[PDB]
Design a protein around this ligand. Sequence first.
Ligand SMILES: Nc1ncnc2c1ncn2[C@@H]1O[C@H](COP(=O)(O)CP(=O)(O)OP(=O)(O)O)[C@@H](O)[C@H]1O
Ligand SMILES: Nc1nc2c(c(=O)[nH]1)N=C(CO)CN2
Ligand SMILES: Nc1nc2c(c(=O)[nH]1)N=C(CO)CN2
Ligand SMILES: [Mg+2]
Ligand SMILES: [Mg+2]
Length: 397
Amino acid sequence: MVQYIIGIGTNSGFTIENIHLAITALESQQNIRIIRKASLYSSKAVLKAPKEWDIRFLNTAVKISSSLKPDELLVLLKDIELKIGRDLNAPAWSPRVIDLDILAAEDLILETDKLTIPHKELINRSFALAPLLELSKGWHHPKYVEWDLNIRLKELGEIVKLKQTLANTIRMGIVNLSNQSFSDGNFDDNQRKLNLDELIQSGAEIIDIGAESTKPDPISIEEEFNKLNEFLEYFKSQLANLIYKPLVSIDTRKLEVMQKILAKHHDIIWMINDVECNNIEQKAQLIAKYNKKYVIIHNVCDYIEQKKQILLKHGIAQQNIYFDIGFGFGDTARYLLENIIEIKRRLELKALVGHSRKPSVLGLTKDSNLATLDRATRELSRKLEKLDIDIIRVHKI
Ligand SMILES: Nc1ncnc2c1ncn2[C@@H]1O[C@H](COP(=O)(O)CP(=O)(O)OP(=O)(O)O)[C@@H](O)[C@H]1O
Ligand SMILES: Nc1nc2c(c(=O)[nH]1)N=C(CO)CN2
Ligand SMILES: Nc1nc2c(c(=O)[nH]1)N=C(CO)CN2
Ligand SMILES: [Mg+2]
Ligand SMILES: [Mg+2]
């Protein structure tokens, strides 16, 4: 058996999902095993050039084991590139859903027309060389056995290693547009813009944008629509400026807001986080049409099962549905908590936990201040991370 390092890149669509589905595709093979995944890296797109093609790349690399021949492996990867949505050998390096390259086969040297290994550009690209050295820290290029590649990596110059990861548990950074987060001054509503930046640098894989206030004791449709829409437009104005383009969750309770925002921005939206049951039938219809993830909140087992039925009854895939215990919505928390793993199994849906700053789930007195809320969220976020909760929804990372 031969160990391969496969380079993965993408700069279009839901980037981290495209990487996850590629990895998942390789692991699905019975003649391949994943040994290790590398970190996530961010880099300016390397072109060779219409302005619109420069949208940052997400790169990593995975070390696999396999008894596949190098030419056989390439066939599989090309197949994997197509299932995901890679175009008909489109123009010379335009936006790509996925790109899977064989970087290295230990010490193999394969120089042919179809395949050359190591990849011919491996040592000129930090977005390829950096993830590889991460997985194989003692690796030398078989035709430059002298070259210290760590120094070579230095000549290639800064490449940003992201705190986003390929873990099983992903963080949902909260982005609140309501009054609660209002600080804006004479010539700048930058508050929400810097908040996103910080969610992103700090490692959030998903952002959850909600316009309606959190505090128990409304706002109108076009009003809530106007807040979400202005930010979503701002977000599109930055797509190419983000070191990392996060998956976006629209958190709304109104069918008419969903309808409106999805008609406009469905292309950049991943999931709908609906806090109330409301028009479930109609909501399922819309989300079925736009093929989005949707989240079922307990606003437990049977209540959620009931709702799941309608959704399936309306045309969405079970895999597109998460349930959420619904912490903060009515001790009793800590036992559902301690048993989320059990619930997930019965239900047959992935789990979403939003324990952020809810003093009960955490087990602190209601009195607790901001830092005390934060540190407790953070420490409990680690418990869930090791318990592989699928999404954890938090104010700070
Ligand atoms: N190590 C490697 N990994 C993947 N393809 C390789 C390869 N070495 C040579 N090739 C070849 O190059 C071909 C084109 O693949 P593409 O993905 O379209 C080019 P690209 O990846 O966009 O450019 P790049 O390789 O400079 O990054 C393959 O069909 C394949 O036969
Ligand atoms: N930053 C970055 N630039 C690229 C990449 C890539 O993966 N990352 N891949 C290319 C062709 O495959 C071309 N340019
Ligand atoms: N899924 C989910 N969504 C939310 C939650 C929550 O706990 N779970 N809490 C909110 C405000 O406290 C707002 N939205
Ligand atoms: Mg490539
Ligand atoms: Mg390629």
